Design a protein around this nucleic acid. Structure first.
Lengths: 165, 60, 92
RNA sequence: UGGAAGUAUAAAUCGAAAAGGUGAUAGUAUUCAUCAAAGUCUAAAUAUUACAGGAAAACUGAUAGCAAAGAAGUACUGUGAA
RNA sequence: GAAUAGCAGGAAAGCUAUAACAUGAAGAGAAAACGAAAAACUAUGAGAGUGUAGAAAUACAUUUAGCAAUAGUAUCUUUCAA
RNA sequence: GAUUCACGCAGUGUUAACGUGCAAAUUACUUGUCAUAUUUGAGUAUAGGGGCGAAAGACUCAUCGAACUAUCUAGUAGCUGGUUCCACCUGAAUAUUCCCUUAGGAAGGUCAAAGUAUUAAUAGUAUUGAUUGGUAAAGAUAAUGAUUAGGUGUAACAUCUUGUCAAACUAUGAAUAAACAAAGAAGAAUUCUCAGUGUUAAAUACACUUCAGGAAUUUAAAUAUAAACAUACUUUGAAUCGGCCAAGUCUGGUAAGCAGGACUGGCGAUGCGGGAUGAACCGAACGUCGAGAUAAAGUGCCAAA
RNA sequence: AAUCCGACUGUUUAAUAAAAACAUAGCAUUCUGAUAAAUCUAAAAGGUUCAUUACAGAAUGUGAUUUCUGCCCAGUGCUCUGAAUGUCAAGGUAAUGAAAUUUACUUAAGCGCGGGUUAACGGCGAAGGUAGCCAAAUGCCUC
RNA sequence: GGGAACGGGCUUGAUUGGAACGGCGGGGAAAGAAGACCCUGUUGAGCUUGACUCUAAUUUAUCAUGUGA
RNA sequence: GGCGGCACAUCUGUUACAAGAUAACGCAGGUGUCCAAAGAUGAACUCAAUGAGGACAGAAACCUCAUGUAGAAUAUAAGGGUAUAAGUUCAUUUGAUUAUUGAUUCCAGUACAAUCAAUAACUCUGAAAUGAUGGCCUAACGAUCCCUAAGAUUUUUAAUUAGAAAGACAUUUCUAGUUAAUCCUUUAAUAAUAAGGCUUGGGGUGUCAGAAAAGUUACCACAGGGAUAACUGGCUUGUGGCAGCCAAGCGCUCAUAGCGACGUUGCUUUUUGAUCCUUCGAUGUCGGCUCUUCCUAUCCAUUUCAAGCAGAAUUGAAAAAAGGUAUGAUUGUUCACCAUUUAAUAGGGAACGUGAGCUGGGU
RNA sequence: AGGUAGAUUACCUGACGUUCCCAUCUGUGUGAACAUAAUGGUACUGAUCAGGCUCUAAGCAUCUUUACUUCCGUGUUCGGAUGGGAACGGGUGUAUCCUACUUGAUAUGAACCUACC
């Protein structure tokens, strides 16, 4: 039976990282958040004012508003049998940019790099390059031939038991 | 006459019959609570564009 | 607990920060002619004994203290509620 | 009593008038409006499951319909009311 | 088929009555006091035509239309507060 | 207001008889009492929050810790019992909040029926990418705490080792998980043109404005799998919120077919084949049938092999 | 032959208790001068004790005889031939106000203070169980 | 045996000829009675008491105009 | 069930299972407060502890240097947070203020309450950026009705001067000066009292979403309940009872004739617990008398082996449950304890066998 | 090469010693005034006679620490699954995921803007 306090069961969640106490980076207060960005809510217990609720810790939300001191973050909360939208205003101390679209934003740039050359190759009449191939799960490896010149064999067999003591 | 106090049994099965209802797209596009200046800037342009659209209707 | 008189607070009527004098709010004398008192006396008349509940299960030992902060130059009065305290006193 | 600082009745005390009552928030003042209490009678339009005489019925049809379709408030019970 | 008043037919049935009122057409406010257009805007969206081809149905391109619904905007009524 | 016997009366014992009796309190024997505080008839008086009582809550017409009778009255009941034709389709519940609440209610979840929408309105799944957590494990001159011993230097203290530990210790930290993304201002992108506010020292930077708006060109691409009787629902409403079982789970307890929990599957609501028998085990879920391959499990007979 | 209880004659739970229970005589207490005390009644030149009058009427406790009834008036009762300005109602008086209203003063019993009372309720290390009696129909340990 | 943990019925066994007379008290968890013990009802009733709220009786004060001092 | 406790409103660590949720009358504790500073801000400083020095002065008084990641302090329970600070010292101050919005926690996505983000005023501190709408964070608290406080001058009207423009045979509008009234209502009109409205606080319900509430019934009653106690049965076996393993010692020497400590493994349902599965429209609730049968963990008789077995009397053990196992005083007693007798006067089960079998002493 | 402001916040720390300073920085002289305190020690201001003594910075060490990699070790643990084995206790096999401590090797900073050399 736990209590119903605001910060119940937070001995280890709100504890600072080992050898990571005190003031934080200045990149935390210097990062530029724009509407539509992806951020991660991380309750920094060193700052007690404006501490987001512990249920939002580690959740990835989107920026929906930018205020002089706080950033409007929008997250989905699971309720009895539905999902509701929660709109928080969190200072930049308790949020962090998310890399959830890091790989996707590279693939976006890779296809746009090829598309840029395509509109130029079309003017010159040469064939235009194809878009990068889509990602696939690890495919069955094809048949390959292994040269016997630099090969060595090691027999694998069950091992005789030896008492550790 | 003691009774069982609590159980989460069958609760996840119940919650997934009619599965987790997602919010609609219009739930993410709400504007209440936005920046005061940004709302002031947006309203000024919308008023300007609408007033310019309406004078064209009068012209034609 | 201990709060001095002679505060300096925003005065809504003067739209300024003016000196104020601080006292403690006491419940006024019950009037015999207010509507709820007249209605209570009518019910208590006649036979029927006690017609309204009489509270006798008190639990709180203290009361929230309400300060009556009054503008000196304009007599505008403000009511500020403090937390419950066993002992309260106005300073010098 | 819906009538709420008293809508109506009654009792104890008190008690008017060169009249006065009412206008439902108690009080006083000046206007305004409308009536003129404290005696009496009065047809018609209205009610009715007593009782009596009739007519009907998407009603019951002898364990139903009145308790009673025959000498039914009878036979029978109780000191009696029943 | 508000009471109610008439008609033929004799009728617990039927028909007829410029008609009180009920609900609604306007909403907010405790109340005094009031009382709704920028002849609207934005997004997606129902439908209607043509051309070509597969070729059996049908599949793509293109022109127009923008109702319902949802969300969001200006503008307007009342409120301390939309 | 002495002792006794008798006519009468009572009711001490048999804890006798009887106990669907002779009897809704009687019979037999034994016993007691058997005239002045005695016994008894008739008349009369006292009436239900009343009467009467040598007092037992006794008696008041087989009715008394408040008679009988009729009316209010078909009193109220969260409690017990019953609730009447067939086929077909769908099909639950024991969480959460509030209650003078705990045998009960209301909000809500699960469920049904009606009625819609071309529909930014699919996922109890995996993969790839960026994260979150502090559990199992691990540690113990790594911080806190516990703990055996041995060296070295100055019992003690330092210092180097050694053995063993923590639900309310921790550096580190999985597996299983949670929440993101993998192209919806409506499927991309680019070039030109470009306005209103504001930020700004000023802006041609920047922010929001259908990536304001407008015109050309290009374009259906951006993990796997499944999904149009898909998906999104709207309204109205029923029943239910006593639950119980299993376990490569946990806590209290010596323990329990004990009490209480986390996840899932069940029984309840469920028959069938098997375990001889069995609510829950194993196989597998059911319209009426025929022929075949099977599942669990079996092949001496009962009993098919 | 002893013990316990009730003194005795008597009465009692009709239908599971006949007794140690009730009554009793004896003892003791309280109130009352009759227009009273107790007490029935909605009321009443109404009713009962009462056709009565303290050797009486009304209300109680203990329960024949013998012996003895100890200490306590703090508490709760009851009582006083007592207390005024501690607290006390409706009223009455006065003041203000245009008036309702408001304010002030003065008022009975009761309670509070003081005295008496335990054959009143009661307690007995206000006073600390006296005289007696006992593993008691009263003593768990205890057979 | 398992099962609601004490079967007449179900599973596996032991076993069985139909109809019954006189006794008997093991069983039918035999009959009689919607347990009277215990608990729960937001169900009662008798009795008690400075439980809450009242009330008859009793009591005290004021008003209700006999004359002359 | 009662007595106890509060698991009833509430906070911290843990049980708790690395998202969220999350049980027990689970574990260790806490709240109904405290603060004009312990709120706000600025500046300066660094704490606990230790080492080495200095008259009294020493293990502890105060001074100096060095080391010192917090091992101190921060009102409090615990857990988090904090080092040019969030701790200490100094200084100024009252933002512990008014008004309007939109969110997050509890959540039914209700209220109260708490947590934020902004906007408009007026302020405080600082050189300034900023910071400040109480306390470093997580607890420190309260509806309807009733009572009681604070607030509704920012502006709108009317009358009369001065000026101006529209208005059928009067009257409105705009402008400046003035004077008066001004949050709404008490319904014929006004006035001063009185009362009632609107917004926000306080008074309080601790059973903390909030009745106004003492007992006893053995004289008892009703609707029900095996949702739930008193008896059997069933799971368990702590406790009761019985049986083993090892071998430190006892037994004159001698671990084991007979015992067996420190430990450790089982069996039984003949004790008492623990539980609440069956039975509340009833399973007659103790003992004794009577009578049958069953178990062996055997008291006697029969057959054996061992001894610290010379005989006698005994002691340990095996086969064996076909046969026997008594009379009485006291007690309702089961039990107990005495007096005898006997070959022995063993232990238990069968709904704690047995009440349409008795008895009724106990309850 | 040096100085200012930084961002990453130990590869940057701590102890033991070493190397220059030409500019720069530091240490360095003074107390009249702003200002400061018990103290010109600090903070403040005015200055330039001396100095690489310290600081700072660059390098040294079988240096503690910290940071990457292997190894530890597919050993701990774990998700799914029997009419699998065991009287229990606990422990397989199968399809999978797979730490930590330790030890060993390497490293002891990279990097941005402005000015001066």
């Amino acid at each position: 039976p736990l209590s119903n306090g605001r910060n119940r069961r937070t001995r280890k969640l709100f504890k600072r990282p080992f050898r990571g106490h005190g003031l934080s980076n200045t990149s935390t207060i210097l990062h530029t958040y724009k509407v539509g960005d992806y951020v991660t809510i991380l309750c920094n217990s060193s700052i007690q004012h404006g501490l987001p609720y512990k249920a939002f810790h580690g959740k990835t939300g989107r920026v929906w508003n930018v205020n002089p001191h706080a950033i409007g973050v929008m997250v989905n909360k699971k309720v009895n049998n539905r999902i509701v939208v929660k709109r928080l205003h969190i200072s930049p101390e308790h949020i962090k940019p998310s890399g959830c679209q890091k790989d996707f934003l590279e693939r976006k740039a890779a296809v746009a790099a090829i598309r840029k050359q395509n509109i130029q190759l079309k003017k010159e009449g040469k064939p235009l390059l194809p878009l990068p191939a889509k990602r696939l799960p690890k495919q069955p490896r094809p048949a390959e031939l292994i040269k016997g010149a630099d090969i060595k064999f090691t027999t694998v067999a069950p091992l005789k038991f030896e008492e550790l003591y | 006459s003691k009774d069982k106090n609590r159980s989460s049994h069958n609760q996840s099965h119940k919650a997934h019959r009619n599965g987790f209802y997602k919010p609609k797209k219009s739930a993410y596009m709400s504007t209440k609570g936005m920046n005061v200046q940004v709302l002031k800037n947006t309203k000024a342009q919308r008023k300007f564009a609408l007033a310019k659209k309406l004078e064209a209707k009068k012209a034609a | 607990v201990v709060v001095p008189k002679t505060r300096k607070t925003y005065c809504p009527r003067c739209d300024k920060h003016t000196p104020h004098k601080v006292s403690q709010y006491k419940k006024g004398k019950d009037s015999l002619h207010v509507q709820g008192k007249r209605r209570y006396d009518r019910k208590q008349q006649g036979f029927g004994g006690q017609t309204k509940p009489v509270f006798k299960k008190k639990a709180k030992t203290t009361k929230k203290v309400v300060l009556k902060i009054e503008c000196t130059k304009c007599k505008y009065k403000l009511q500020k509620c403090l937390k419950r305290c066993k002992h309260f006193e106005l300073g010098n």
